[PDB]
Each structure stands twice: as C-alpha cells, then as structure tokens.
Amino acid sequence: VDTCSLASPASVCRTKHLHLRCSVDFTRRTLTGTAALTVQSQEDNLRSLVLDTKDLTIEKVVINGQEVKYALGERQSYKGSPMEISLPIALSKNQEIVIEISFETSPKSSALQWLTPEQTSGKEHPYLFSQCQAIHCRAILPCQDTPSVKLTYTAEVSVPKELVALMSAIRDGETPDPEDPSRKIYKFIQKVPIPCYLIALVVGALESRQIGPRTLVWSEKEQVEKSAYEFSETESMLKIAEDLGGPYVWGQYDLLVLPPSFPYGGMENPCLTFVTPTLLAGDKSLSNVIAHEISHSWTGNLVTNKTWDHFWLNEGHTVYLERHICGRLFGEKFRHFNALGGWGELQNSVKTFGETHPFTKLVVDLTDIDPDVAYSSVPYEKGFALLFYLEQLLGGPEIFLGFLKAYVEKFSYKSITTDDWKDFLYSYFKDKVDVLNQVDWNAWLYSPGLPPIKPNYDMTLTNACIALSQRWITAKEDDLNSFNATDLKDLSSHQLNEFLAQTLQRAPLPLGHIKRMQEVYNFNAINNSEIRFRWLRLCIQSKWEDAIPLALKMATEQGRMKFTRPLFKDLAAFDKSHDQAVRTYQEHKASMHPVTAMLVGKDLKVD
Numbered sequence: 001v002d003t004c005s006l007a008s009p010a011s012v013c014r015t016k017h018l019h020l021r022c023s024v025d026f027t028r029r030t031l032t033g034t035a036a037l038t039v040q041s042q043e044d045n046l047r048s049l050v051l052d053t054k055d056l057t058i059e060k061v062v063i064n065g066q067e068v069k070y071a072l073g074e075r076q077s078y079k080g081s082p083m084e085i086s087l088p089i090a091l092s093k094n095q096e097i098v099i100e101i102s103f104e105t106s107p108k109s110s111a112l113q114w115l116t117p118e119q120t121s122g123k124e125h126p127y128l129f130s131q132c133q134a135i136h137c138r139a140i141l142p143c144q145d146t147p148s149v150k151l152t153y154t155a156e157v158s159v160p161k162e163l164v165a166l167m168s169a170i171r172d173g174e175t176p177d178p179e180d181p182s183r184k185i186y187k188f189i190q191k192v193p194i195p196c197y198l199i200a201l202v203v204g205a206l207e208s209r210q211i212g213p214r215t216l217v218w219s220e221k222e223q224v225e226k227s228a229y230e231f232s233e234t235e236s237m238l239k240i241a242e243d244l245g246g247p248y249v250w251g252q253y254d255l256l257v258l259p260p261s262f263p264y265g266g267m268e269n270p271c272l273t274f275v276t277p278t279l280l281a282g283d284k285s286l287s288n289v290i291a292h293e294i295s296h297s298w299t300g301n302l303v304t305n306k307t308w309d310h311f312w313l314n315e316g317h318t319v320y321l322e323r324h325i326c327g328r329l330f331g332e333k334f335r336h337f338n339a340l341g342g343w344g345e346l347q348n349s350v351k352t353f354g355e356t357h358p359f360t361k362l363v364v365d366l367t368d369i370d371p372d373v374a375y376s377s378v379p380y381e382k383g384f385a386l387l388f389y390l391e392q393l394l395g396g397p398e399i400f401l402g403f404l405k406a407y408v409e410k411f412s413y414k415s416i417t418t419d420d421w422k423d424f425l426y427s428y429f430k431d432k433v434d435v436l437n438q439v440d441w442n443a444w445l446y447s448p449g450l451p452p453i454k455p456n457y458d459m460t461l462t463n464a465c466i467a468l469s470q471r472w473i474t475a476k477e478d479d480l481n482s483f484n485a486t487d488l489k490d491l492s493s494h495q496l497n498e499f500l501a502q503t504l505q506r507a508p509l510p511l512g513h514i515k516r517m518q519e520v521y522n523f524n525a526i527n528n529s530e531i532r533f534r535w536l537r538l539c540i541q542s543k544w545e546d547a548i549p550l551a552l553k554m555a556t557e558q559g560r561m562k563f564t565r566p567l568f569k570d571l572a573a574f575d576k577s578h579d580q581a582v583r584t585y586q587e588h589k590a591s592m593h594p595v596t597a598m599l600v601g602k603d604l605k606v607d
C-alpha cells in the first residue's frame, strides 16, 4: 500500500514503458505533449485504471486509435487529482496495452522550476529543470507515481534550437523539429527499468566537458572549467563503487551542475546526476556528495524502496556506501570522522523535531503527510547508524560489505520494504542469528528519538575539533586574547567545519566571543558553503547584527534547502532581522523553486 499515490497499485496493473513526446514552451512555461504508457494488467477482466496527476491539463486519452472516457477526481492536496481511465476492452491478466495521454503542465508545476535569463549564468537564455523525488513526477505527466513500479522510457523533446535538452537517460541524437524550424528535437532512451521519481529533464544553454571515460560534466559555460576540476575524482569513485556494489549497469555517469536554486545537494537521476553549484568549493572538499550520488546507482536506483515509508533503505545504504568510498580514498580514520559527524547531525535533527516526533522514526508512516514536509537527515543518519552498528556487531566492514553486495545482487531491479531487507539480513547472516536477535529491532526501526545504541567511533581526527570548540565555549572574556589564527594551523576544511558544528550545538555563544572568532579566524572570508552556512548560523543565533546581511545574502543567492531553510528560520528567530527575513522571503517567493518556496513559507508561518 503506497499511501502517497492515488494510482492503481502494482497489484492491479503496472506500467512497463513510457514514451514521452513533448515540447518545452518557455513563453507559456508549460510542457505540452503525449505520454504513451505501456501498461500490463495484473488482474482478470480489468476495465479501468487510475493514474496520478497534479495540476495537469488533460486534452484527451487515446487507446487503439480512438478517444476513450476518463475522469479527473477532486484534488487531494499535495497528492494531486486521480485520473480514472475507462478501458475500451476488458483486459486479461498479463495483457499489455498502450495508453496515449495528451497533456500540458501548469506553470506552477511543483516538479519544475522555470528560470528567466537573468536568473541564469549567461543572462541571454532561459532555463528549466525538474526534480521528481518524491512524488512530483505526477506534476509533469500522468503516471503511477509510486516507486513500487519500475518502467523503461524513451523521449523526444522539442526545444528552442539554441538550447540543449538532457534527461536521466542515454542521449540518442538530435535533429531540427520538422514542425517548427526555430526548434530542435532531442531524443533519449532509458533501457534499465526505473521508478518514475528518477525521470528528469533539464533544458538550457548547456556545454559539456569530458572528465573521465564515462563522465561528462554539463553546465552553463561559465561553470564548466570550475566543475571539471571540482569533480575530477568522479571516475576513481565510480571504480571503487563498482568494486563494492557490482557492475555499473547504467552506461554513462554524467554530471549536471544546476543553477543555485537547485533544492538538494544532488539528485541521483540515472545517467545524469544533478548537483548544486554550492559544491564548487575550489578544492574538491565537498566531493562526498558525488560519492553519495554515485552510490545511489546501486542503492536506490537498482534496489529501490517500495514506498516512501521505507525511504531509509535508499538513504541509509547510500550513506553507508558513500562513507566507504571516502574511506578507501582518504583512509579508515576519515570514514570514522564522517560517520561521527553524521551522528552529530542526527542529534541535531532529533533535537529539532523533538525526541518523540514521528519523523524521527526510521520507518515512518506517511499517511496524510506531505513527503516534502517529512524530509530530513533522519533516514540518512539513523539509517547509516543502524548499518554501522550492524557492521560492528557482525564482524567488521569486510564482512558487512559482503552483505551489501549480496543485497544489491538479490534485489536489483526490484522494489522492497524493510521486512524484505531484514529477512535477507537474517538469511545472509544465518550463522550469526543469535547476534542479530540481540538487536532491539523495534526501537531501531519503529521508535522515535536517538537510536538505543550508539556505535563505536574512532576519535582521532575529531579530537582537535572538540578540543578547540570546548576552549571557546569555556572561555571567559579574559581568555579571548589567547585565541589566534595559529589555532587553525593543522585543521583541514573538514575539521574547521566540525569545529563550527560542535560550537553551533552549544549556541548562542556570547557576542564578544563571536566577534573575537571573526577577528582571529576571519571565517567571513571562507566561501566553502558548508563552513559558511554553519558560521553564519552561529553568528545569527549569537545575535550578531553584522551577520544579518551576510545570512540574508546566502539565504537568497542560492537555494539549497539544507542552507536556505535554516538560515531563514534563524533570521526569523532573531528579533533584529525578523521583519527583514519575512520581507525578503515575500519579495523572492515568486522566483524561488516551488517546493523550497512552500517549505520556507511554512517555516516562517507566512501566507
């Protein structure tokens, strides 16, 4: 039961393939065309079925060359409106038909952001990008919008001829549009079955540069050189991912670097990972996000969660693989450092929600909950903490990586629940079942709050961060002079970040301390987005007015929700910036990403 979808479930029928033929109209901000669904009945005598839709305009539905009857149900908030289609002939079990739906999107499509030329790098052309996860695919095309169904797809996309279209698929050529010579048609094929949340489309003034044997980087011209360098470790990460997970089956691993309003650090669209330009630190320091997106090529895209209640399967195993990639590249002490930081972020998320909040559960119940509202670090870090704890219980990383590989092999091309995972865990480790039975499954999987057991972490790289943070927190006024730029001498960017994270957990600090920190460390000069984010939060929570314009600028000049949401909230909580925060939100709202706009608005208690 997928409680987020209004469509016929996989038990009733299942989409096998989508052929998408559409045209991107920047003047109207609509995508217009046809979705031909090849649908296989799972039932005897099937006479109707139901698809998800959201703010779609349906022109007609055609089966066997003729228009058929359909009806759009009443809108159910964020889930959209169900579309019931009356089949012309009753179908037997396993019979397949093709249903061709003519449709057009709304400019308000929660799947899409339409950018004016002035919102891009080049300032001449507009730009469009999608983001379907979790349940926004229904906002682009009518579909069974549930990850419990996997389909192949092909697409032909007509765009203004000066622009480029890309999708989560292999590029299959380009031509002039025979119906409109100011246009080009780009073609795409995705031969590996995917859940519909992995369908993606970008259209803009895109250039590419090759950075490995199976990876091009795509962006506007002004970001291409910087991106090629930032992500140069991509091939080496892919090789390691393939060693841990099995064959990379998707063909290409390209990267697309989006404009700054892109709402997530990255999105694992198959063949074309989408990433935030806030990763462009200049020193490859935020490359863990690439490792994470690469890892999804196995955990998430090959083995997929059956419903969003089981999202942690996708994320926990991805973070687990991500951290192994980073440990291979930079050493086991480094894996433990990132693991231990992740526990910190989990502490934060639980503290923010409250230790009894249902969204701090590992398996959640999304009945009547917008998935975008529930989204947090919990499934990532609670899921990782579970896997790390099991690793230590069951004999160590080599042993647990054997399990992870066998798990991917077992459930490739399938969608699964937590009980499937747990069942296979018990099967794989059946000689260690007595150890497995010592795990508090109910607490770990189903209870709110921090997990019942914290794993063991190497502290080596973290000690200096904690030590410096403690010096600052325990400092009195007459200790401030002792701080000096040399305190940072032997700290990496990852350590400066962890120092700020540790300090931010005890915020506010006295204003005099924060002013001193700027004096001696000049954190205002650091443009690493993770570091700047935490520093600005520490400044604002410690009531430093000078930081207000800095925080407002970062909150609005990029749109990664990880950064924009807490910055707006912090600025709302500070009396001196509260009205500015609300005003700035109001002014920027119309040009923000629709989901980001909705969430910041809720956070601010606005509109």
Ligand SMILES: c1ccc(NCc2cccnc2)cc1
Binding pocket: 133, 134, 308, 309, 310, 311, 312, 364, 371, 372, 374, 375, 376, 378, 379
């Ligand atoms: C992208 C956007 C929203 C979601 N939401 C599903 C979800 C959130 C938190 C916990 N469990 C499941 C997932 C991906």
Ligand SMILES: [Yb+3]
Binding pocket: 476, 478, 479
């Ligand atoms: Yb003193």
Ligand SMILES: [Zn+2]
Binding pocket: 292, 296, 314, 315, 318
């Ligand atoms: Zn992920």
